[PDB]
From a paper:
In the case of R273H and R273C, it was shown that the replacement of threonine by arginine at position 284 (T284R) restores activity to both p53 mutants. The crystal structures provide high-resolution information on various R273-related mutants including the oncogenic single mutants: R273H and R273C, the rescued double mutants: R273H/T284R, R273C/T284R, R273H/S240R and R273C/S240R, and their complexes with DNA. A superposition of the mutant structures onto one of the wt core domain structures shows that their 3D structures are similar to that of the wt protein, demonstrating that mutations located at the protein surface have a negligible effect on the structure of the protein. Similar geometrical features of the protein surfaces are displayed by the crystal structures of the single mutants: R273H and R273C, and of the double mutants: R273H/S240R, R273H/T284 and R273C/T284R in the absence of DNA. The mutation sites of these proteins are compared with the corresponding region of the wt p53-DNA complex by modeling the central A/T doublet as shown in Supplementary Figure S4, confirming again the inability of His or Cys residues at position 273 to interact with the DNA target. The arginine side chains of the second-site mutations in these structures (T284R and S240R) display a range of conformations in their free state, but a single conformation is observed in their DNA-bound state. Reactivation of these proteins is achieved by new interactions formed by the second-site mutations, T284R or S240R, with the DNA backbone.
Numbering used by the authors: 96 to 288
């Protein structure tokens, strides 16, 4: 019933990478390789890189979806808290309830699953930019992890899926995410164990 989170590289050798951003006070987004966990700020650019060994055809799509990490909460749909959804932060594309947005891509598509009610955001796959070995997507997380009513400090996974134009699954990967005021300090803190 719960969406699969099993890693699969598949035919194209698909995996994720992240900027090596460090943990200074001013970083807005920082990834910990030890924890496989992203720490980022509400509404700020969160670059996720897509790495492939061979190029997928045009038509290929890239989906992102959040699920709760813990088993007791896994079947609960991850959505925004009431204070955040019912606030004028819309971009005219994203449904107000969706945690994950994509910025700087007018081909963005949002889905409420007709059967699971789960939210996801999908953008066209595009090959790497000139002078770059990966494809970057800028995600936005629109709720703090601390938001009472929403996640309420409960840890979440973001699952990134590569799909062909006909919806066939090509590859999958995932990472944990914390949305917080001081990503840098918080990453340092959580690695201390
Ligand atoms: Zn919130």
């Amino acid at each position: 019933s719960v969406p699969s989170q099993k890693t699969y590289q598949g035919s194209y050798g698909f995996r994720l990478g992240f900027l090596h951003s460090g943990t200074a006070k001013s970083v807005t987004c920082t990834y910990s390789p030890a924890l496989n966990k992203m720490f980022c700020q509400l509404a700020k650019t969160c670059p996720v890189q897509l790495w492939v060994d061979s190029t997928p055809p045009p038509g290929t799509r890239v989906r992102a979806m959040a699920i709760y990490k813990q088993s007791q909460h896994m079947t609960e749909v991850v959505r925004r808290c009431p204070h955040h959804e019912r606030c004028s932060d819309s971009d005219g594309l994203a449904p107000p309830q969706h945690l994950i947005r994509v910025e700087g891509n007018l081909r963005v598509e949002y889905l409420d699953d007709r059967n699971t009610f789960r939210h996801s955001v999908v953008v066209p796959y595009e090959p790497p930019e000139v002078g770059s070995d990966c494809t970057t997507i800028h995600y936005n997380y629109m709720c703090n992890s601390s938001c009472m009513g929403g996640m309420n400090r409960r840890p979440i996974l973001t699952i990134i899926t590569l799909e062909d134009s006909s919806g066939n699954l090509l590859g999958r990967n995932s990472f944990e995410v914390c949305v917080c005021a001081c990503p840098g300090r918080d990453r340092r803190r959580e690695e201390e164990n």
